[PDB]
Amino acid sequence: RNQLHDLRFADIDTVIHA
Amino acid sequence: NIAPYKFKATMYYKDVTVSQVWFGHRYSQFMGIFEDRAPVPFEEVIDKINAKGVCRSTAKYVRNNLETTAFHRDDHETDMELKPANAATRTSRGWHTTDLKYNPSRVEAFHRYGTTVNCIVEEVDARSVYPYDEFVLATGDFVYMSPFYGYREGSHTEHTSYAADRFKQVDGFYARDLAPTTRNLLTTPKFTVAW
Amino acid sequence: NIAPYKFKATMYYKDVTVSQVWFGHRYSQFMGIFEDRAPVPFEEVIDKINAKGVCRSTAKYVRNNLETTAFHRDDHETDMELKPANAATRTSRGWHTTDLKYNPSRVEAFHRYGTTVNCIVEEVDARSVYPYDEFVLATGDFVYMSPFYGYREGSHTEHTSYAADRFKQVDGFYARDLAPTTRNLLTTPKFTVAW
């Protein structure tokens, strides 16, 4: 459950840059 | 009876994440990331999450004896709508307000700090064993308070390790799904649990 | 059958470590250390580690939605030869490129940041249980992908939680020890596993 936090509550592939 | 006492509980916390980024001539690098689970106050859990299903875009809490205040994207306070989390096999229901982590804009040869506050609420299965003076959560976090602690019918005699102001009991609480019930609330140093 | 499905797997990751050091009048102190496990891309695992037994001296990966690039000792990219790790009782084979951690030179009343990138490759024993939709590694890291996932003979129907671009299958892969075999590759957010 703890390791699923990133995959459950966050985007893993989206990249933001400027 | 060897089976621990199992009961349903709901966790409330904000994933405060402030990262330091170094912008080079042709690359970007993380000079440091600080992740912290900020608890949600009773006022927000009742008047904002349960009453309207929204979380404040700021995290105000005490950490290392300091009243720290984190702002999402360094913007002013705003009500963020809670949405379901990404699907996961064999996992309880969970909701969050933010998905993309925020970082500062790119400025040459300069360090910048970008704060991210993502309100998170989850339904976890709590477990307890004799003498039932404390219970754990599905996330592995320990709660040093008896599950039956309260102000009614002698429940005040149960074990408790947190201060009096860190616990709150609400009668006639109507749970809002993102009949009356007696809801208990405890603000731990890293999260807020309601059962 | 209660015994979990056991199979051999190889992990690939770089221990990105950037530390902040404060140089006083007569002492040095660590104002902050940020440790992160950067995964190794398929191109480096195939064309550099497996093909030549070397790792790039830089770690390019995505972290908190940002394309971070870490350079070992802040130097230009260079091919680092992999060497065996220090002996340890009851441990599988492992190799690394760097041993000494790097810190900035001493300059008075100034903060400095020193990055360290140590490519690490290890052979870990993977375990899985029914329905075999995911497996764990000897390091305790979970991999949310069926061990039998693949593009051949209906293997695409297996469970998978990562994007399509995060998985790669190579046929006729000749493993280089630092006959043909079908090698699977997955780039997790913190490491790259090959089995």
mmCIF file of C-alpha atoms in Angstrom:
data_model
loop_
_atom_site.group_PDB
_atom_site.id
_atom_site.type_symbol
_atom_site.label_atom_id
_atom_site.label_comp_id
_atom_site.label_asym_id
_atom_site.label_seq_id
_atom_site.Cartn_x
_atom_site.Cartn_y
_atom_site.Cartn_z
ATOM 1 C CA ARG A 1 0.000 0.000 0.000
ATOM 2 C CA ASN A 2 2.779 2.455 0.870
ATOM 3 C CA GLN A 3 4.582 1.916 -2.442
ATOM 4 C CA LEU A 4 1.299 2.388 -4.347
ATOM 5 C CA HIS A 5 1.031 5.975 -3.051
ATOM 6 C CA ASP A 6 2.896 7.472 -6.011
ATOM 7 C CA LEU A 7 0.890 5.471 -8.564
ATOM 8 C CA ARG A 8 -2.390 6.243 -6.768
ATOM 9 C CA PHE A 9 -1.996 9.915 -5.767
ATOM 10 C CA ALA A 10 0.367 11.291 -8.436
ATOM 11 C CA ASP A 11 1.232 11.337 -12.130
ATOM 12 C CA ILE A 12 4.335 9.320 -13.010
ATOM 13 C CA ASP A 13 4.722 10.066 -16.748
ATOM 14 C CA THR A 14 3.689 13.717 -17.157
ATOM 15 C CA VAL A 15 6.668 16.070 -17.517
ATOM 16 C CA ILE A 16 6.481 19.849 -17.030
ATOM 17 C CA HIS A 17 9.229 22.154 -18.294
ATOM 18 C CA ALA A 18 9.667 25.779 -19.336
ATOM 19 C CA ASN B 1 -9.174 -14.749 20.478
ATOM 20 C CA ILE B 2 -5.988 -14.009 18.534
ATOM 21 C CA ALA B 3 -7.590 -11.990 15.722
ATOM 22 C CA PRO B 4 -6.905 -8.255 16.267
ATOM 23 C CA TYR B 5 -9.874 -5.938 16.676
ATOM 24 C CA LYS B 6 -10.571 -4.663 13.150
ATOM 25 C CA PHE B 7 -12.534 -1.468 12.503
ATOM 26 C CA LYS B 8 -12.834 1.042 9.668
ATOM 27 C CA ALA B 9 -11.068 4.410 9.890
ATOM 28 C CA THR B 10 -10.439 7.369 7.579
ATOM 29 C CA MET B 11 -7.103 9.182 7.281
ATOM 30 C CA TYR B 12 -6.682 12.854 6.349
ATOM 31 C CA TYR B 13 -3.331 14.397 5.458
ATOM 32 C CA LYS B 14 -1.612 16.664 2.940
ATOM 33 C CA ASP B 15 1.570 15.643 1.136
ATOM 34 C CA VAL B 16 3.601 18.835 1.547
ATOM 35 C CA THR B 17 6.473 18.635 -0.947
ATOM 36 C CA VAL B 18 8.952 21.489 -1.465
ATOM 37 C CA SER B 19 11.769 20.821 -3.940
ATOM 38 C CA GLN B 20 14.918 22.800 -4.736
ATOM 39 C CA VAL B 21 15.848 22.867 -8.432
ATOM 40 C CA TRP B 22 19.134 24.052 -9.935
ATOM 41 C CA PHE B 23 18.849 25.363 -13.498
ATOM 42 C CA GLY B 24 22.075 24.957 -15.440
ATOM 43 C CA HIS B 25 23.069 26.223 -18.857
ATOM 44 C CA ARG B 26 21.536 23.167 -20.558
ATOM 45 C CA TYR B 27 20.062 20.978 -17.792
ATOM 46 C CA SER B 28 17.932 20.912 -14.643
ATOM 47 C CA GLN B 29 18.709 19.091 -11.396
ATOM 48 C CA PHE B 30 17.029 18.516 -8.033
ATOM 49 C CA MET B 31 19.286 19.941 -5.330
ATOM 50 C CA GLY B 32 16.914 18.682 -2.622
ATOM 51 C CA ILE B 33 13.352 17.480 -2.003
ATOM 52 C CA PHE B 34 11.551 17.656 1.354
ATOM 53 C CA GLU B 35 8.414 15.511 1.674
ATOM 54 C CA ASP B 36 6.178 15.787 4.737
ATOM 55 C CA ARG B 37 2.676 14.595 5.647
ATOM 56 C CA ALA B 38 0.841 17.574 7.124
ATOM 57 C CA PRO B 39 -2.272 16.754 9.203
ATOM 58 C CA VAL B 40 -5.661 18.312 8.468
ATOM 59 C CA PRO B 41 -7.273 20.293 11.329
ATOM 60 C CA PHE B 42 -10.682 19.431 12.739
ATOM 61 C CA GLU B 43 -12.157 22.636 11.315
ATOM 62 C CA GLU B 44 -11.126 21.648 7.787
ATOM 63 C CA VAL B 45 -12.132 17.993 8.190
ATOM 64 C CA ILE B 46 -15.620 19.049 9.324
ATOM 65 C CA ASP B 47 -16.421 22.394 7.653
ATOM 66 C CA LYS B 48 -14.501 21.777 4.380
ATOM 67 C CA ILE B 49 -13.973 18.070 3.603
ATOM 68 C CA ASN B 50 -17.071 16.557 5.208
ATOM 69 C CA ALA B 51 -19.305 19.608 4.755
ATOM 70 C CA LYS B 52 -18.303 20.495 1.165
ATOM 71 C CA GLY B 53 -15.802 17.884 -0.054
ATOM 72 C CA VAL B 54 -12.939 20.356 -0.541
ATOM 73 C CA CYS B 55 -9.502 20.917 0.981
ATOM 74 C CA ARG B 56 -7.686 24.164 1.641
ATOM 75 C CA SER B 57 -4.808 24.801 -0.756
ATOM 76 C CA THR B 58 -2.512 25.519 2.230
ATOM 77 C CA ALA B 59 -1.068 23.302 4.964
ATOM 78 C CA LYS B 60 -0.799 24.913 8.411
ATOM 79 C CA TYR B 61 0.637 22.633 11.087
ATOM 80 C CA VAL B 62 3.315 22.278 13.754
ATOM 81 C CA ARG B 63 6.610 20.605 12.860
ATOM 82 C CA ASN B 64 9.700 20.570 15.088
ATOM 83 C CA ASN B 65 8.022 23.153 17.353
ATOM 84 C CA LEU B 66 7.391 25.649 14.512
ATOM 85 C CA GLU B 67 4.122 26.856 12.970
ATOM 86 C CA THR B 68 4.918 26.086 9.331
ATOM 87 C CA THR B 69 2.542 27.210 6.566
ATOM 88 C CA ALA B 70 2.879 25.701 3.083
ATOM 89 C CA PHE B 71 1.050 27.107 0.044
ATOM 90 C CA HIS B 72 0.285 25.051 -3.051
ATOM 91 C CA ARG B 73 2.215 26.540 -5.985
ATOM 92 C CA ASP B 74 2.891 29.549 -3.708
ATOM 93 C CA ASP B 75 -0.615 30.767 -4.593
ATOM 94 C CA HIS B 76 -3.272 32.222 -2.324
ATOM 95 C CA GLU B 77 -5.577 29.959 -0.337
ATOM 96 C CA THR B 78 -8.235 28.339 -2.526
ATOM 97 C CA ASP B 79 -10.790 25.564 -2.110
ATOM 98 C CA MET B 80 -9.680 22.506 -4.100
ATOM 99 C CA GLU B 81 -12.247 19.898 -5.110
ATOM 100 C CA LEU B 82 -11.444 16.336 -4.062
ATOM 101 C CA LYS B 83 -11.419 13.667 -6.772
ATOM 102 C CA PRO B 84 -10.929 9.882 -6.667
ATOM 103 C CA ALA B 85 -7.407 8.521 -6.856
ATOM 104 C CA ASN B 86 -6.072 6.345 -9.656
ATOM 105 C CA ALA B 87 -7.392 2.792 -9.744
ATOM 106 C CA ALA B 88 -5.292 0.167 -7.966
ATOM 107 C CA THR B 89 -5.964 -3.527 -7.435
ATOM 108 C CA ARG B 90 -6.772 -4.554 -3.856
ATOM 109 C CA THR B 91 -6.880 -1.053 -2.369
ATOM 110 C CA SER B 92 -9.462 0.883 -0.394
ATOM 111 C CA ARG B 93 -11.119 4.055 -1.643
ATOM 112 C CA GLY B 94 -8.991 7.191 -1.676
ATOM 113 C CA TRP B 95 -9.248 10.762 -2.926
ATOM 114 C CA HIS B 96 -6.817 13.600 -3.592
ATOM 115 C CA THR B 97 -6.894 17.193 -4.821
ATOM 116 C CA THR B 98 -3.625 17.456 -6.798
ATOM 117 C CA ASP B 99 -1.854 15.067 -9.177
ATOM 118 C CA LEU B 100 1.003 16.963 -10.856
ATOM 119 C CA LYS B 101 3.913 18.027 -8.667
ATOM 120 C CA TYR B 102 4.878 21.695 -8.935
ATOM 121 C CA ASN B 103 8.403 22.990 -9.534
ATOM 122 C CA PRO B 104 9.683 26.542 -10.085
ATOM 123 C CA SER B 105 10.000 28.070 -13.581
ATOM 124 C CA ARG B 106 13.458 27.796 -15.292
ATOM 125 C CA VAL B 107 15.788 30.785 -14.509
ATOM 126 C CA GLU B 108 19.533 30.392 -15.407
ATOM 127 C CA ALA B 109 22.272 29.806 -12.731
ATOM 128 C CA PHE B 110 19.735 30.167 -9.862
ATOM 129 C CA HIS B 111 18.259 27.933 -7.153
ATOM 130 C CA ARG B 112 14.447 28.088 -6.733
ATOM 131 C CA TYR B 113 11.998 26.499 -4.292
ATOM 132 C CA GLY B 114 8.600 25.197 -5.393
ATOM 133 C CA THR B 115 6.073 24.028 -2.797
ATOM 134 C CA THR B 116 3.355 21.448 -3.487
ATOM 135 C CA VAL B 117 0.429 20.712 -1.146
ATOM 136 C CA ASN B 118 -1.782 17.765 -2.149
ATOM 137 C CA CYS B 119 -4.682 17.097 0.214
ATOM 138 C CA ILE B 120 -5.216 13.349 0.598
ATOM 139 C CA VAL B 121 -8.029 11.440 2.301
ATOM 140 C CA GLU B 122 -8.137 7.641 2.468
ATOM 141 C CA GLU B 123 -10.218 4.878 4.009
ATOM 142 C CA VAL B 124 -7.911 2.522 5.922
ATOM 143 C CA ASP B 125 -8.541 -0.628 7.926
ATOM 144 C CA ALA B 126 -7.461 -0.129 11.535
ATOM 145 C CA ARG B 127 -6.311 -3.020 13.722
ATOM 146 C CA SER B 128 -5.822 -3.352 17.472
ATOM 147 C CA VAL B 129 -4.888 -6.045 19.996
ATOM 148 C CA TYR B 130 -5.322 -6.553 23.721
ATOM 149 C CA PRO B 131 -5.301 -4.436 25.938
ATOM 150 C CA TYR B 132 -6.589 -2.375 22.959
ATOM 151 C CA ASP B 133 -4.736 0.712 24.228
ATOM 152 C CA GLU B 134 -3.481 1.592 20.721
ATOM 153 C CA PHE B 135 -4.189 0.761 17.089
ATOM 154 C CA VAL B 136 -2.398 0.718 13.744
ATOM 155 C CA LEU B 137 -3.572 1.712 10.273
ATOM 156 C CA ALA B 138 -3.332 0.064 6.866
ATOM 157 C CA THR B 139 -0.445 2.426 6.036
ATOM 158 C CA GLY B 140 1.656 1.046 8.904
ATOM 159 C CA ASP B 141 1.299 4.159 11.071
ATOM 160 C CA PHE B 142 0.783 3.633 14.796
ATOM 161 C CA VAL B 143 -1.850 5.567 16.749
ATOM 162 C CA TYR B 144 -1.162 5.646 20.494
ATOM 163 C CA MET B 145 -4.779 6.006 21.580
ATOM 164 C CA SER B 146 -7.379 3.423 22.491
ATOM 165 C CA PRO B 147 -9.949 2.974 19.680
ATOM 166 C CA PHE B 148 -12.727 3.345 22.277
ATOM 167 C CA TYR B 149 -11.373 6.538 23.863
ATOM 168 C CA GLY B 150 -13.966 9.269 24.246
ATOM 169 C CA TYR B 151 -15.763 11.654 26.559
ATOM 170 C CA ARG B 152 -18.965 9.601 26.930
ATOM 171 C CA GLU B 153 -19.907 6.826 29.399
ATOM 172 C CA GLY B 154 -16.526 6.404 31.080
ATOM 173 C CA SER B 155 -14.557 6.301 27.826
ATOM 174 C CA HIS B 156 -12.259 9.013 29.223
ATOM 175 C CA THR B 157 -10.518 6.365 31.364
ATOM 176 C CA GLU B 158 -8.995 4.711 28.281
ATOM 177 C CA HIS B 159 -5.314 5.064 27.440
ATOM 178 C CA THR B 160 -4.140 8.142 25.540
ATOM 179 C CA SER B 161 -0.694 9.559 24.776
ATOM 180 C CA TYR B 162 -1.643 12.794 22.962
ATOM 181 C CA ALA B 163 -2.707 16.080 24.513
ATOM 182 C CA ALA B 164 -6.344 16.904 25.202
ATOM 183 C CA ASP B 165 -6.499 19.499 22.407
ATOM 184 C CA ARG B 166 -5.357 16.870 19.870
ATOM 185 C CA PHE B 167 -8.584 14.825 20.226
ATOM 186 C CA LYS B 168 -12.138 15.795 19.276
ATOM 187 C CA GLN B 169 -15.434 13.893 19.441
ATOM 188 C CA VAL B 170 -18.492 14.913 17.404
ATOM 189 C CA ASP B 171 -21.987 13.559 18.054
ATOM 190 C CA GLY B 172 -24.615 13.155 15.365
ATOM 191 C CA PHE B 173 -21.962 13.187 12.645
ATOM 192 C CA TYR B 174 -23.330 12.520 9.143
ATOM 193 C CA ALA B 175 -20.483 11.136 7.031
ATOM 194 C CA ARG B 176 -20.283 12.666 3.556
ATOM 195 C CA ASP B 177 -19.556 10.121 0.816
ATOM 196 C CA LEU B 178 -17.071 11.817 -1.511
ATOM 197 C CA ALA B 179 -27.845 7.960 9.746
ATOM 198 C CA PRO B 180 -26.113 9.782 12.626
ATOM 199 C CA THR B 181 -22.899 8.419 14.108
ATOM 200 C CA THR B 182 -20.441 9.314 16.865
ATOM 201 C CA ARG B 183 -17.235 10.346 15.082
ATOM 202 C CA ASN B 184 -13.888 10.539 16.868
ATOM 203 C CA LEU B 185 -11.062 12.721 15.562
ATOM 204 C CA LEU B 186 -7.369 12.731 16.476
ATOM 205 C CA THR B 187 -4.719 15.051 15.005
ATOM 206 C CA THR B 188 -1.469 13.104 15.040
ATOM 207 C CA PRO B 189 1.827 14.888 14.256
ATOM 208 C CA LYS B 190 1.756 13.502 10.681
ATOM 209 C CA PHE B 191 -1.928 12.819 9.923
ATOM 210 C CA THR B 192 -5.524 13.066 11.136
ATOM 211 C CA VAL B 193 -7.560 9.881 11.658
ATOM 212 C CA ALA B 194 -11.340 9.666 12.024
ATOM 213 C CA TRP B 195 -13.204 6.552 13.147
ATOM 214 C CA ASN C 1 0.994 -24.476 -3.265
ATOM 215 C CA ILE C 2 1.857 -21.765 -0.736
ATOM 216 C CA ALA C 3 5.449 -21.166 -1.871
ATOM 217 C CA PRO C 4 5.635 -17.909 -3.887
ATOM 218 C CA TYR C 5 6.841 -18.098 -7.474
ATOM 219 C CA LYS C 6 10.590 -17.446 -7.245
ATOM 220 C CA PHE C 7 12.628 -16.274 -10.239
ATOM 221 C CA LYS C 8 15.919 -14.453 -10.774
ATOM 222 C CA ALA C 9 15.942 -10.760 -11.701
ATOM 223 C CA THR C 10 18.551 -8.015 -12.098
ATOM 224 C CA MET C 11 18.128 -4.458 -10.802
ATOM 225 C CA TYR C 12 19.733 -1.361 -12.342
ATOM 226 C CA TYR C 13 19.778 2.023 -10.628
ATOM 227 C CA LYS C 14 22.035 4.958 -9.779
ATOM 228 C CA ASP C 15 22.341 6.323 -6.247
ATOM 229 C CA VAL C 16 22.059 10.051 -6.966
ATOM 230 C CA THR C 17 23.297 11.864 -3.855
ATOM 231 C CA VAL C 18 23.624 15.661 -3.679
ATOM 232 C CA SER C 19 24.748 17.084 -0.330
ATOM 233 C CA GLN C 20 24.885 20.665 0.948
ATOM 234 C CA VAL C 21 27.941 21.464 3.080
ATOM 235 C CA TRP C 22 28.478 24.560 5.223
ATOM 236 C CA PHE C 23 32.131 25.508 5.726
ATOM 237 C CA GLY C 24 32.698 27.374 8.972
ATOM 238 C CA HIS C 25 35.771 29.115 10.307
ATOM 239 C CA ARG C 26 37.090 25.865 11.821
ATOM 240 C CA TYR C 27 34.542 23.139 10.989
ATOM 241 C CA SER C 28 32.393 21.580 8.268
ATOM 242 C CA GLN C 29 28.734 20.578 8.540
ATOM 243 C CA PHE C 30 26.112 18.916 6.343
ATOM 244 C CA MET C 31 23.239 21.360 5.889
ATOM 245 C CA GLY C 32 21.278 18.756 3.907
ATOM 246 C CA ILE C 33 21.635 15.504 1.955
ATOM 247 C CA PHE C 34 19.241 14.333 -0.775
ATOM 248 C CA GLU C 35 19.493 10.655 -1.744
ATOM 249 C CA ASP C 36 17.540 9.290 -4.707
ATOM 250 C CA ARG C 37 17.613 6.072 -6.745
ATOM 251 C CA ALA C 38 17.626 7.080 -10.407
ATOM 252 C CA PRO C 39 16.596 4.352 -12.893
ATOM 253 C CA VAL C 40 18.798 3.359 -15.830
ATOM 254 C CA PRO C 41 17.233 3.702 -19.314
ATOM 255 C CA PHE C 42 16.901 0.775 -21.698
ATOM 256 C CA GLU C 43 19.480 2.304 -24.041
ATOM 257 C CA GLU C 44 22.091 2.363 -21.272
ATOM 258 C CA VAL C 45 21.172 -1.081 -19.916
ATOM 259 C CA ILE C 46 21.589 -2.592 -23.395
ATOM 260 C CA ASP C 47 24.197 -0.510 -25.263
ATOM 261 C CA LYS C 48 26.364 0.398 -22.220
ATOM 262 C CA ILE C 49 25.982 -2.039 -19.300
ATOM 263 C CA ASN C 50 25.208 -5.266 -21.159
ATOM 264 C CA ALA C 51 27.127 -4.386 -24.330
ATOM 265 C CA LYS C 52 30.263 -2.922 -22.686
ATOM 266 C CA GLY C 53 29.879 -3.228 -18.903
ATOM 267 C CA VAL C 54 29.953 0.529 -18.249
ATOM 268 C CA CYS C 55 27.539 3.130 -16.887
ATOM 269 C CA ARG C 56 27.119 6.748 -17.890
ATOM 270 C CA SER C 57 28.471 9.197 -15.320
ATOM 271 C CA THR C 58 25.154 11.118 -15.439
ATOM 272 C CA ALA C 59 21.639 10.268 -14.261
ATOM 273 C CA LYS C 60 18.812 11.532 -16.489
ATOM 274 C CA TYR C 61 15.334 10.631 -15.254
ATOM 275 C CA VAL C 62 11.916 11.999 -14.333
ATOM 276 C CA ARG C 63 11.197 12.907 -10.713
ATOM 277 C CA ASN C 64 8.114 14.803 -9.522
ATOM 278 C CA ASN C 65 7.262 15.584 -13.168
ATOM 279 C CA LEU C 66 10.666 17.178 -13.917
ATOM 280 C CA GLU C 67 13.474 16.028 -16.223
ATOM 281 C CA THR C 68 16.318 16.103 -13.698
ATOM 282 C CA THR C 69 19.912 15.520 -14.838
ATOM 283 C CA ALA C 70 22.591 14.729 -12.244
ATOM 284 C CA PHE C 71 26.316 14.725 -13.067
ATOM 285 C CA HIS C 72 28.883 12.790 -11.055
ATOM 286 C CA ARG C 73 31.254 15.289 -9.419
ATOM 287 C CA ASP C 74 29.696 17.923 -11.726
ATOM 288 C CA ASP C 75 31.990 16.600 -14.473
ATOM 289 C CA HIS C 76 31.189 15.887 -18.103
ATOM 290 C CA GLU C 77 29.614 12.594 -19.133
ATOM 291 C CA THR C 78 32.109 9.722 -19.045
ATOM 292 C CA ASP C 79 31.921 5.938 -19.279
ATOM 293 C CA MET C 80 32.602 4.419 -15.847
ATOM 294 C CA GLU C 81 33.755 0.810 -15.595
ATOM 295 C CA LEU C 82 31.657 -1.411 -13.337
ATOM 296 C CA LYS C 83 33.455 -3.313 -10.577
ATOM 297 C CA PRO C 84 32.267 -5.870 -8.002
ATOM 298 C CA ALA C 85 30.908 -4.604 -4.710
ATOM 299 C CA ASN C 86 32.463 -5.277 -1.322
ATOM 300 C CA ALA C 87 32.122 -8.827 -0.035
ATOM 301 C CA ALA C 88 29.152 -9.524 2.235
ATOM 302 C CA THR C 89 27.994 -12.783 3.787
ATOM 303 C CA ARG C 90 24.767 -14.227 2.365
ATOM 304 C CA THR C 91 24.310 -11.699 -0.443
ATOM 305 C CA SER C 92 23.870 -11.988 -4.190
ATOM 306 C CA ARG C 93 26.344 -10.609 -6.710
ATOM 307 C CA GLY C 94 26.418 -6.845 -7.145
ATOM 308 C CA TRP C 95 28.515 -4.256 -8.953
ATOM 309 C CA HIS C 96 28.987 -0.497 -8.737
ATOM 310 C CA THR C 97 31.008 2.229 -10.446
ATOM 311 C CA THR C 98 31.756 4.631 -7.560
ATOM 312 C CA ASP C 99 32.728 4.063 -3.922
ATOM 313 C CA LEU C 100 33.745 7.424 -2.426
ATOM 314 C CA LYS C 101 31.029 10.040 -2.005
ATOM 315 C CA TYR C 102 31.843 13.460 -3.455
ATOM 316 C CA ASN C 103 31.504 16.760 -1.591
ATOM 317 C CA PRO C 104 32.438 20.308 -2.637
ATOM 318 C CA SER C 105 35.878 21.810 -1.885
ATOM 319 C CA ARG C 106 36.189 23.918 1.344
ATOM 320 C CA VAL C 107 35.417 27.670 0.794
ATOM 321 C CA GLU C 108 34.863 29.843 3.950
ATOM 322 C CA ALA C 109 31.357 31.074 5.047
ATOM 323 C CA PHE C 110 29.704 29.586 1.908
ATOM 324 C CA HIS C 111 27.200 26.825 1.125
ATOM 325 C CA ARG C 112 28.154 24.448 -1.733
ATOM 326 C CA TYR C 113 26.380 21.554 -3.455
ATOM 327 C CA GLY C 114 28.217 18.399 -4.517
ATOM 328 C CA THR C 115 26.433 15.769 -6.611
ATOM 329 C CA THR C 116 27.353 12.070 -6.612
ATOM 330 C CA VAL C 117 26.043 9.517 -9.132
ATOM 331 C CA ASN C 118 26.984 5.882 -8.436
ATOM 332 C CA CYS C 119 25.661 3.398 -10.987
ATOM 333 C CA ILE C 120 24.577 0.192 -9.247
ATOM 334 C CA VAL C 121 23.520 -3.154 -10.716
ATOM 335 C CA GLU C 122 22.476 -6.112 -8.565
ATOM 336 C CA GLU C 123 21.106 -9.620 -8.952
ATOM 337 C CA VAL C 124 18.009 -9.982 -6.762
ATOM 338 C CA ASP C 125 15.633 -12.860 -6.123
ATOM 339 C CA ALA C 126 12.111 -11.921 -7.197
ATOM 340 C CA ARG C 127 9.025 -13.451 -5.584
ATOM 341 C CA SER C 128 5.372 -13.532 -6.616
ATOM 342 C CA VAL C 129 2.104 -15.065 -5.408
ATOM 343 C CA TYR C 130 -1.254 -15.880 -6.949
ATOM 344 C CA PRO C 131 -2.756 -14.346 -9.140
ATOM 345 C CA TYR C 132 0.891 -13.503 -10.015
ATOM 346 C CA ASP C 133 -0.134 -10.006 -11.151
ATOM 347 C CA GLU C 134 2.837 -8.385 -9.365
ATOM 348 C CA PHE C 135 6.171 -9.335 -7.831
ATOM 349 C CA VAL C 136 8.589 -8.071 -5.193
ATOM 350 C CA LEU C 137 12.384 -7.945 -5.141
ATOM 351 C CA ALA C 138 14.992 -8.907 -2.561
ATOM 352 C CA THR C 139 15.343 -5.204 -1.679
ATOM 353 C CA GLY C 140 11.686 -4.996 -0.616
ATOM 354 C CA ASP C 141 10.603 -2.952 -3.643
ATOM 355 C CA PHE C 142 7.265 -3.832 -5.230
ATOM 356 C CA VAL C 143 6.862 -4.154 -9.001
ATOM 357 C CA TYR C 144 3.246 -3.793 -10.144
ATOM 358 C CA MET C 145 3.580 -5.915 -13.271
ATOM 359 C CA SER C 146 3.003 -9.601 -13.858
ATOM 360 C CA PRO C 147 6.320 -11.503 -14.160
ATOM 361 C CA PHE C 148 4.999 -13.130 -17.354
ATOM 362 C CA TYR C 149 3.879 -9.890 -19.023
ATOM 363 C CA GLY C 150 5.083 -9.519 -22.593
ATOM 364 C CA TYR C 151 4.179 -8.969 -26.218
ATOM 365 C CA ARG C 152 4.427 -12.623 -27.309
ATOM 366 C CA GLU C 153 1.826 -15.437 -27.303
ATOM 367 C CA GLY C 154 -0.954 -13.623 -25.454
ATOM 368 C CA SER C 155 1.307 -12.296 -22.696
ATOM 369 C CA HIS C 156 -0.080 -8.797 -23.356
ATOM 370 C CA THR C 157 -3.263 -9.758 -21.467
ATOM 371 C CA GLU C 158 -1.388 -9.900 -18.149
ATOM 372 C CA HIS C 159 -1.790 -7.207 -15.513
ATOM 373 C CA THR C 160 0.290 -4.033 -15.779
ATOM 374 C CA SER C 161 0.158 -0.688 -13.976
ATOM 375 C CA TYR C 162 2.920 1.220 -15.817
ATOM 376 C CA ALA C 163 2.677 2.961 -19.170
ATOM 377 C CA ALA C 164 3.491 1.194 -22.426
ATOM 378 C CA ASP C 165 6.716 3.170 -22.931
ATOM 379 C CA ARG C 166 7.987 2.017 -19.511
ATOM 380 C CA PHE C 167 8.263 -1.646 -20.616
ATOM 381 C CA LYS C 168 10.571 -3.186 -23.219
ATOM 382 C CA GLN C 169 11.077 -6.778 -24.377
ATOM 383 C CA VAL C 170 14.216 -7.914 -26.222
ATOM 384 C CA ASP C 171 14.483 -11.239 -28.048
ATOM 385 C CA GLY C 172 17.720 -13.149 -28.468
ATOM 386 C CA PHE C 173 19.295 -11.294 -25.551
ATOM 387 C CA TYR C 174 22.776 -12.553 -24.616
ATOM 388 C CA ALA C 175 23.386 -11.667 -20.965
ATOM 389 C CA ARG C 176 26.848 -10.241 -20.303
ATOM 390 C CA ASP C 177 28.466 -11.593 -17.129
ATOM 391 C CA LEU C 178 30.149 -8.598 -15.494
ATOM 392 C CA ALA C 179 22.647 -18.972 -25.180
ATOM 393 C CA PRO C 180 19.890 -16.576 -26.306
ATOM 394 C CA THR C 181 17.117 -15.577 -23.918
ATOM 395 C CA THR C 182 13.997 -13.408 -23.939
ATOM 396 C CA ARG C 183 14.779 -10.470 -21.641
ATOM 397 C CA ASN C 184 12.066 -8.215 -20.229
ATOM 398 C CA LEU C 185 12.825 -4.671 -19.082
ATOM 399 C CA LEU C 186 10.741 -2.299 -16.961
ATOM 400 C CA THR C 187 11.744 1.242 -15.948
ATOM 401 C CA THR C 188 10.129 1.878 -12.581
ATOM 402 C CA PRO C 189 10.158 5.405 -11.093
ATOM 403 C CA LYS C 190 13.088 4.448 -8.812
ATOM 404 C CA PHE C 191 14.861 1.564 -10.585
ATOM 405 C CA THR C 192 15.044 -0.636 -13.682
ATOM 406 C CA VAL C 193 14.483 -4.397 -13.360
ATOM 407 C CA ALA C 194 15.384 -7.033 -15.951
ATOM 408 C CA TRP C 195 14.236 -10.650 -15.805
#
